[PDB]
Design a protein around this nucleic acid. Structure first.
Lengths: 84, 101, 108, 93, 81, 106, 169, 74, 68, 75
RNA sequence: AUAUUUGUUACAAUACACAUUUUUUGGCACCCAAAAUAGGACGGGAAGAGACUUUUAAAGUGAGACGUCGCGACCCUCGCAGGAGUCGUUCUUGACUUUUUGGUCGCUUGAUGUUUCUCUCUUCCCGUUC
């Protein structure tokens, strides 16, 4: 379900970043969590989706996609999310 | 004598006395005798109203009451009159109530 | 005697609750609490226009009126229409009840 | 929008997102949880919306767009003295 | 009532206060009574016009309180069962 | 308010008879006497309709200049005109003075 | 099927989008893969329920139009929609974002539909549209957008906004 | 500890003159000799003068309501 | 050592002025009766702020002070 | 019903705001259930600290209704 | 071999109690002033000028004060875990303890609300109305 992003623009703000992420991930499926709880930034964001299929699709399509200068490294999460 | 000592009926006799003999007897005698009363609210708007009913808190039911309110801006005055057939009035707004002759 | 017990028998009647703000509420009346908390159903609540060379109305009542979410954008004058407003008792000033009902039956 | 039960008291409605009006012209929107005898109530996720003085002038009679400055304050407890009227915004999850 | 009992459940935690005078007192809640008058410890104060100061101890009258902001994790607290 | 049998004297005519001639005032009385039955509640609605009006202490009738009273008796007739009319089903235009008197007197 | 009132009523308005506002509606059985071929008709059934966000993603909609006055609505997600033109006067003061990815909007058709505004939206995504490819498309989009906070995830550069304003003058 | 109404009783029997501030809306302050009081902190003042806020006019023996009381100051 | 309530019991049917808290208006008249809350009834009152008023009822919350 | 708990405050110099405008500072003496607070050596604080400040009386009592916030400047 | 109904007890819950400084029988109200006709008004954006400010003729638009979240960065910073651990108990629950990114600086005018004082015209573009 969850997709752990990495290698993104740290210079952008938190809320804005979250919004951007939401915008990105709405095409694949219904995004349950807007932004990662830790909010460390610099790539580390967990895009929580309703469906696994949607998540998979996202992983497939947005692997190395141009988001704020740098290519985002998509990957599946190790542990399941608290909301899911 | 404080009110918390009295029993349930002694409060009823106390309220009967306060309405019959007391300040609010001005309103009570006004309700029975069908004498129109003048009421000034805090708002500053005065109603000429006949009192159908009244109560401890002074909230009262008036029928055919006429409301008189004036307003001024930079010393330019206008007098406005508003007629309502039925009124229930909450008693906290009133200040002075007089019984017309 | 508590005269609020009268209002309890006025249920399901068209009424205006005219508040301390000057805000007036036309609506169908539902159960009135012993503290005179008055709960209505289909209500059009507004503020009168003092004319007087367009003297400024209540500034707090306009904000409280737009903040009900019921004021529609295209209303020329200042009004709002909404369902289910619940009004605290101490806010009421006057209540204008309909002309049809008879008091002699209800005031007992 | 939303139709509230024709007879529904403050006890009947719980967890509905409400819209609360105070004496000062500000509004607290959020889920109601508890309330009390004197009607001071507890909102879960609440945002106070306010009307700008320039916005208030715009509201005076002549499509209007008001900029309503609002700030988010979670799990508050209001005071019955300040509350003026209450309206229903949404229905529970 | 539950609303006051939740305020008693918030003792020893950072809370926010809005007085009807317009000020804002945010700080740690030491005491609270059933009259809603509370006393707060090591509290940052915001005057109605925005000037912010700091005071170590404060006692406020409950009648003058407007809203109280309580830590969110008290939402699921057993009072609401 | 009387719990005992007694004789009490009051004047039905009050102001109107004092203002207007005696033949006409009985007629204005009879226009009223028919009417208050047809005015179940609007009587106090129409008689008090001008709130400036007050009832004199000795008198029973609302004391007034008598122009609205001519309007009051006319409105009241129309309430009698429709209530007599609706039961038999007559148009308001079909109503004539000979019918209007037959409504008044019958 | 076609976007009716019944469908709207049916739609799951329980799970609120917690990023901003409340009531993230998804029209029909599911707005994601609803297949609304015609324009978004029967918008009045929602009645401005609630930054109210509506997800229309994976649907057949040709035109971004036919809305009822929605005061709340702040977010539109329209991804995988065959949008061609989105000209309207209903949703003007309202709305803070618009996601238009993977649609059919023209570079000139998108520019024409808005007609320009002194202030509008705040977040906009036009990605995977034919128009974005078009030469000077970013400059044209910035000039059309008039006021804008974003353009396909990258903010119009302050200097770019100044140069675009000069082009407009 | 000195309860406040005890202190007021010490204003009654000690016959000390007191100045008393009213609410900020009224704009006058009263001063006189506090004689006796009730549970509601409404007090009778003998030989009281009302000063606007020293040409104020003398009042009398006057009962003053406790609702408008702000300060009672010697 | 007179307290307020016996002070009102001693001022019955005497000429008393009462200053309200608002306009600095005082009603000058013969007191009739008082309630527990110190509601006031007056006869032959006159409003000073100039007029003459037959009978008066004054609610307790609006009075500022009572004098003779 | 319940007495307010000032018990740690008494005998300590305390500032408290009377109404919207006012701020009085004095050594707290006693208090009651309505919060009526009697204190001694009262001083009315103003913008200019030494200048516009003027003492009130040897003993001053305050109606609890006009009390907004009470801060102790002290241990 | 043939879950429903009836009675009792408890809990939740609605209708009958309180006008005296801590919530519901009010410290209430007031700044004041601005459109009328028979191509025309009104709003928004951009430019010019007057009058304002600053320097010794040349530069932008009523002025001075709290905060609020933001545009840049010559900086810091590793990078995948509201939850976490323990014990009881059996395939995920309770009881007891540890405690939020942003930590900052400019703004060569972010962008924007309070509060005091004093006194706009011209041109173009876009919407509404007759």
């Amino acid at each position: 379900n969850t997709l752990y992003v990495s290698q993104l623009n740290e210079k952008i703000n938190m809320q804005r970043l979250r919004v951007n992420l939401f915008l990105l991930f709405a095409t694949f499926g219904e995004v349950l969590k807007v932004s990662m709880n830790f909010k460390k930034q610099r790539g580390q964001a967990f895009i929580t989706m309703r469906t696994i299929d949607q998540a998979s699709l996202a992983q497939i399509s947005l692997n190395g996609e141009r988001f704020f200068g740098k290519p985002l490294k998509v990957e599946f999460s190790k542990s399941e999310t608290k909301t899911l | 004598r404080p009110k918390h000592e009295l029993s349930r009926a002694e409060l009823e006799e106390l309220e009967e006395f306060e309405f019959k003999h007391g300040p609010m007897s001005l309103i009570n005698d006004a309700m029975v005798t069908r004498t129109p009363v003048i009421i000034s609210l805090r708002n500053n708007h005065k109603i000429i109203a006949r009192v159908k009913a009244f109560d401890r808190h002074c909230n009262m039911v008036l029928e055919n009451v006429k409301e008189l309110w004036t307003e001024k801006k930079g010393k330019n005055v206008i007098n406005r009159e508003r007629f309502i057939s039925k009124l229930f009035l909450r008693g906290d707004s009133v200040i002075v109530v007089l019984k017309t002759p | 005697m508590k005269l609020v017990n009268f209002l309890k028998k006025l249920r399901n009647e068209q009424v205006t609750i005219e508040l301390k703000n000057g805000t007036t509420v036309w609506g169908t009346l539902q159960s009135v609490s012993p503290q005179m908390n008055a709960i209505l159903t289909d209500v059009k609540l507004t503020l009168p226009q003092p004319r007087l060379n367009k003297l400024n109305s209540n500034g707090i009542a306009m904000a409280s009126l737009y903040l009900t979410g019921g004021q529609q954008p295209t209303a020329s004058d200042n009004i709002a229409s909404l369902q289910y407003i619940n009004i605290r008792g101490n806010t009421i000033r006057q209540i204008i009840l309909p002309d049809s009902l008879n008091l002699d039956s209800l005031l007992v | 929008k939303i139709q509230v039960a024709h007879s529904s008291r403050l006890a009947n409605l719980i967890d509905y997102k409400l819209r609360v009006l105070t004496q000062d012209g500000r509004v607290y929107i959020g889920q109601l949880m508890a309330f009390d005898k004197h009607m001071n109530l507890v909102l879960n996720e609440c945002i106070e919306e306010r009307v700008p003085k320039t916005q208030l002038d715009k509201l005076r009679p002549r499509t209007l767009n008001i900029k309503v400055e609002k700030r988010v304050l979670g799990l508050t407890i209001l005071r019955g003295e300040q509350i003026l009227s209450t309206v229903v915004e949404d229905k529970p999850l | 009532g539950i609303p006051v009992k939740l305020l008693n459940e918030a003792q020893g935690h950072i809370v926010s206060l809005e007085l009807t005078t317009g000020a804002t007192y945010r700080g740690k809640l030491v005491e609270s009574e059933d009259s809603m008058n509370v006393q707060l410890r090591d509290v940052i104060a915001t005057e109605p016009q925005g000037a912010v100061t700091h005071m170590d101890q404060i006692f406020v009258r409950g009648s003058q309180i407007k809203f109280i902001v309580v830590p969110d994790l008290l939402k699921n607290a057993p009072l609401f069962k | 308010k009387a719990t005992e049998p007694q004789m009490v004297l009051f004047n039905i005519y009050d102001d109107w008879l004092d203002r207007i001639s005696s033949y006409t005032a009985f007629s204005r009385l009879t226009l009223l006497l028919r009417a208050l039955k047809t005015n179940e509640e609007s009587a106090k609605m129409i008689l008090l309709s001008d709130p400036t009006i007050t009832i004199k202490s000795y008198h029973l009738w609302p004391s007034f200049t008598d122009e609205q009273w001519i309007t009051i008796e006319s409105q009241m007739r129309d309430l009698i005109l429709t209530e007599y009319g609706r039961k038999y089903n007559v148009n308001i235009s079909a109503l004539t003075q000979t019918e209007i008197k037959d409504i008044i007197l019958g | 099927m076609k976007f009716t009132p019944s469908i709207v009523i049916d739609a799951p308005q329980y799970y609120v989008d917690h990023f901003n506002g409340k009531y993230n509606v998804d029209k029909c059985v599911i707005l994601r893969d609803l297949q609304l071929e015609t324009d978004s008709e029967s918008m009045p059934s929602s009645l401005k329920h609630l930054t109210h966000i509506l997800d229309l993603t994976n649907n057949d909609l040709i035109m971004i139009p036919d809305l009822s006055r929605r005061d709340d609505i702040h977010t539109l997600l329209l991804g995988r929609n065959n949008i061609v033109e989105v000209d309207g006067r209903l949703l003007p003061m309202n709305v803070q974002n618009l996601t238009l990815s993977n649609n059919s909007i023209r570079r000139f058709e998108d520019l024409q539909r808005l007609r320009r505004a002194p202030r509008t939206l705040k977040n906009l995504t036009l990605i995977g549209n034919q128009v974005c490819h078009l030469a000077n498309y970013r400059e044209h989009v910035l000039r059309l957008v008039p006021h804008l906070e974003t353009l396909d995830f990258q903010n119009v550069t302050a200097e770019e906004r100044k140069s675009a304003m000069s082009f407009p003058r | 500890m000195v309860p406040p109404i005890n202190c007021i009783f010490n204003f009654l029997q000690q016959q000390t003159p007191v100045t008393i501030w009213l609410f900020e809306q009224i704009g006058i302050r009263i001063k006189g000799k506090i004689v006796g009081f009730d549970e509601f902190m409404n007090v009778v003042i003998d030989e009281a003068v009302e000063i606007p806020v020293e040409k104020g006019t003398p009042l009398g023996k006057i009962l003053l309501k406790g609702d408008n009381i702000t300060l009672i100051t010697s | 050592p007179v307290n307020p309530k016996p002070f009102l019991k001693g001022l019955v049917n005497h000429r008393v002025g009462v200053k309200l808290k608002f306009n600095s208006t005082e009603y000058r008249g013969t007191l009739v009766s008082t309630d527990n809350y110190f509601n006031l009834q007056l006869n032959e009152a006159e409003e000073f702020v100039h007029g003459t008023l037959g009978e008066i009822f004054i609610r307790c919350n609006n009075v500022l002070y009572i004098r003779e | 019903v319940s007495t307010p708990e000032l018990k740690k405050y008494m005998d300590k110099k305390i500032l408290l705001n009377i109404n919207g405008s006012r701020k009085v500072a004095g050594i707290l003496r006693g208090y009651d259930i309505f919060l009526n607070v009697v204190l001694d050596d009262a001083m009315e604080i103003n913008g200019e600290d030494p200048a516009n400040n003027h003492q009130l009386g040897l003993q001053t009592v305050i109606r609890g209704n006009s009390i907004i916030s009470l801060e102790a400047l002290d241990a």
